RNA sequence: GAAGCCCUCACGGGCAAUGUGGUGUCAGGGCUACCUCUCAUCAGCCGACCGUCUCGACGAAGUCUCUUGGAACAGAGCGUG
């Protein structure tokens, strides 16, 4: 909400999650806000996901601007439990980072484009 | 970075990426490359002596003489641990 400056259409979010699932199987992904933050800082992040139902918002507030000054692309997901399930967790996840996609580097790279265009 | 914890005989359930657990805590630590090494620390097992306080068992040698007296545990005499 305060850290969300653009709305991601339902369909875009699905493509994103889908890509994330093939990422945990084919490539590499980081689950959890602390491990995600470190990707963006270490530059190893290619696409970071951030839930929008995070309370307190403090936990994720920094992702956006941090991602911006690091060139890393990011996309918002409405449900926290969807991101966690997509990432492969039995629990939810406030943030995730596809650390080097897998059999999705295409669809992925394009999701990053659609979002950059989503302003 | 799920390698973790709780409940339950089990099955099974719950917690946990908003981080369970590993590492680590100024002899600073982590990371990288090395040297040596552990006897520090932490976790868990076993598990007292002595002392002190109280309680309890066992525990030596006269119940002799005369006098006074209601009564000798008194006086005089003899004897014991
Ligand atoms: Mg510890």
User: What's the CA gap between A80 and A68, in Å, rounded?
Assistant: 22
CATH 3.30.1330.30 fits A1-119, yes or no: yes
How many CB atoms sit inside 10 A of residue A85's CB? 17
Q: Which helix (H) or strand (E) holds A77?
A: strand A74-77
Tokens 């996840």 belong to A93
- Cα–ligand 1 centroid distance for A37 (angstroms): 24
- Cα–ligand 1 centroid distance for A60 (angstroms): 27
CB A95 within 8 A of CB A48: yes
| Two structure tokens written together for A50 | 């951030």
DSSP helix/strand/coil, A108: helix
DSSP helix/strand/coil, A28: coil
Dihedral sign for Cα A15, A10, A40, A83, please. negative
The structure's method of determination equals X-ray
Amino acid A1 CA to nucleotide B11 C1' distance, rounded Å: 44
CB A61 within 8 A of CB A94: no
Nucleic strand B interface residues, CB < 7 Å: A 31-36, 51, 53-56, 59, 80, 84, 87, 89-95
């Amino acid at each position: 909400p305060v850290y969300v400056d653009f709305d991601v259409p339902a369909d875009l979010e699905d493509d994103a999650l889908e890509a994330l699932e093939v990422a945990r199987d084919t490539g590499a992904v980081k689950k959890g806000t602390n491990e995600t933050t470190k990707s963006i800082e270490r530059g190893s992040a290619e696409l970071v996901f951030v839930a929008e139902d995070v309370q307190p918002e403090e936990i994720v507030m920094h992702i956006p601007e941090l991602a911006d000054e690091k060139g890393v692309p990011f996309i918002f997901v409405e449900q926290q439990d969807d991101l966690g399930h997509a990432a492969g967790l039995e629990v939810g996840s406030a943030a995730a980072a596809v650390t080097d996609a897998g059999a999705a580097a295409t669809v992925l790279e394009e999701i990053a484009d659609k979002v950059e265009e989503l302003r």
